[model samples]
Target chain A: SNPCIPFFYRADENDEVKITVI
Target chain B: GGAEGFHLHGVQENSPAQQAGLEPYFDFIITIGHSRLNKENDTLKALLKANVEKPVKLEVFNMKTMRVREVEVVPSNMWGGQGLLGASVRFCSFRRASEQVWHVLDVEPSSPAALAGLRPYTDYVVGSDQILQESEDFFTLIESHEGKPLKLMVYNSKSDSCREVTVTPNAAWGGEGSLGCGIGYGYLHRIPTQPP
Candidate 1:
């Protein structure tokens, strides 16, 4: 099994950040 | 998917990339030495495969700080694990959960971790002597130990019990780097509430 897990994160214009684990 | 550069998803515990201070979700690999990283660039993998037990310089761009830095990493197979650098990356954009559980992927024969009863797939590293928020923290803990006895709080998922184990990391184990073990970032699996 591969050990690496991928997720996502985005930053808005106001510098607010959101992270989502896919 | 094609992209101009590749983003590091996860850096394997005790791997060369970790040793080089490569950070996941922060560093974008721009080039491997003189070769620039591109959408079709397979040079990084090819270089790693061709130069096992050899040092390679990588130019990386940090996403958060937006600083470019160069790091030298040595790829080796002495640890008895897959891949040369032991880091996973992707060309397209991908993200991961903040919470992570490290699992043993492979343990070298007669190694310190193996001698301490570390079993692959069965053992889960929930935390160490200090709180671990990132995989690099574990690497830092190990490095701080050097040739000293590194205390690790491991959890046996099978028995649902936690135990403290000591591992003496050394480079003389006929493997590259210290701690002859392969560890990868795992999902947020079950862990005990308190460490033993």
Candidate 2:
């Protein structure tokens, strides 16, 4: 188990930009 | 099983989901580690929190390809993104696919398809060199590439076969059709592994 970060963390559920390219 | 889960909204830039190559909208997180979700008693949030910063295997259902794939993404709060996944999911459901493919049947002797070693009654073109939406698109591609070879990812149900067979379409194969093979579809020609 990784201990560098917090043991309990909630995953972000915010909608992000969808990049569009040709 | 029917396809049902949290529908992914959009993947954030530089987030764990984006870095792990998760596609938004098209991908559904069906299972998290050992926990099947949105039906969540274990809950997605709790599972992500429990496995944060650790590489977790997620069974993702992709709508575009209509296939389930395992994607490993490490959930992190330090990714400088919004959520643990940097992607939002809404509770929704989808339908399973029959998995469309061109069924190769009754190959004529010495014809392009037959000469390419396409089998009759058992062979199915699961995929091809180009992405075709339907059999009509595949037919158009076959017509467009006359005299040129096209590669097909073929599967044989009887032997459980998978191979890419390259066959050229020609008008002068002395056959009624370009491919010179019977194309079967719908219920009668469904793939052996097709979900009900």
Clashing pairs in 1: A6-B95, A7-B95, A7-B96, A8-B95
Cα lDDT tens digits, model 2, B1-196, are 2567766655788888888877754567888887777573447777787889898899888754667889998889897768788886654564633345667889899999888999998997755545443234456668888999887767687786467688999998887888899998766675664341
Per-residue lDDT tens digits for candidate 1, residues B56-141, read 88888764345568889898887555577777776543223223446766788888777777887667664544433324556666
User: What is model 1's DockQ versus the real complex?
Assistant: 0.04
Cα lDDT of model 1 by residue, A1-22, tens digit:
2122222322345543322111
**Candidate 2 regions off by >4 Å?**
A1-22, B1-29, B33-96, B133-136, B194-196
Q: Please list the residue runs of candidate 1 whose C-alpha ends up more than 4 Å from where it truly belongs after superposition.
A: A1-22, B1-3, B93-196
Q: Who wins the DockQ comparison?
A: 1
